[PDB]
User: Fold Hypoxanthine-guanine phosphoribosyltransferase from Thermus thermophilus.
Amino acid sequence: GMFTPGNGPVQISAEAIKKRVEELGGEIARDYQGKTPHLICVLNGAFIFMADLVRAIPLPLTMDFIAISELLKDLRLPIHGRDVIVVEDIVDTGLTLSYLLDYLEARKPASVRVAALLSKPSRRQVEVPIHYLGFEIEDAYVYGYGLDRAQFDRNLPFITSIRPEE
Amino acid sequence: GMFTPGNGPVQISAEAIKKRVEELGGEIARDYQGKTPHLICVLNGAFIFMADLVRAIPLPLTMDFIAISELLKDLRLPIHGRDVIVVEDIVDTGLTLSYLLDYLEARKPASVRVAALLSKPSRRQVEVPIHYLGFEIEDAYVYGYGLDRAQFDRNLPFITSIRPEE
Assistant:
């Protein structure tokens, strides 16, 4: 053991995350009963959230991975006519998600909903929907659970943060 | 709940996987004490193994994702001079891993070791090393825990399989 949280104001334990992710998985399973969703993980930050979330959705489903920052990595599976669920790590300005939604809508999916681990509503620059949200937080420098701190710390099992000064 | 195992000969519970992944994470943490590994997840199949494994390695580390089947997705972070750890879902023929190793060695990393969830040694067509292995199995059609069955079932929290006939 060596996992150490930062001194920032945002702190979410692995247990709190686990419980919240299972609740979200449950809601998705419920809302999509009778359907076969297609989950798209936004790399790299959402990969752990994606891994825990899919295991909490008892439904037949497919998935894909996309990297955006400008489309870094493209989709491989069709989305036309599919019930798509975008899986985001964090939504702050909403600029990236807005682009992604327009990009997906262009292919005419049957529907699209968004699942996001974190949301910083005070940073919104554009209106974007979040149907399944893990936690709403203040605008602090957060990391862990897939999110990085200069490429490091994505392996922290919890979400933590640092102070503005540091 | 609705997760159902196939009728195949290979069956590995979520609990067995969890325990094994924590043991592997422990070994890596031990072997790499004093170092900063760079873990490369082979998409799409190894993403869940990757998520659980990194959370079991109490060390500062970075990561990247690559998709190969022909390089489908390329690396973004440098590996030259880095202690690299390839994270594979399954090694059967060893052809794909062999290519990947040659591709990485070309960039002159400080070192390279391989972590793989599953291994089907009876399918080997070329010699490749596996330093951290989850489980060795027979040549059965396996899926779950990130591995797909025609794009479906990657969300199963356990590893299961089907019979040759089906």
User: Anything to note?
Assistant: The CA atoms of residues 55 and 80 of chain B lie 25 Å apart. DSSP finds three helices and eight strands in chain B. Chain B touches chain A at residues 1-3, 14, 29, 41, 43-44, 47-48, 50-52, 54-55, 57-65, 67, 72-73, 76-77, 146, 151-157 (CB under 8 Å).
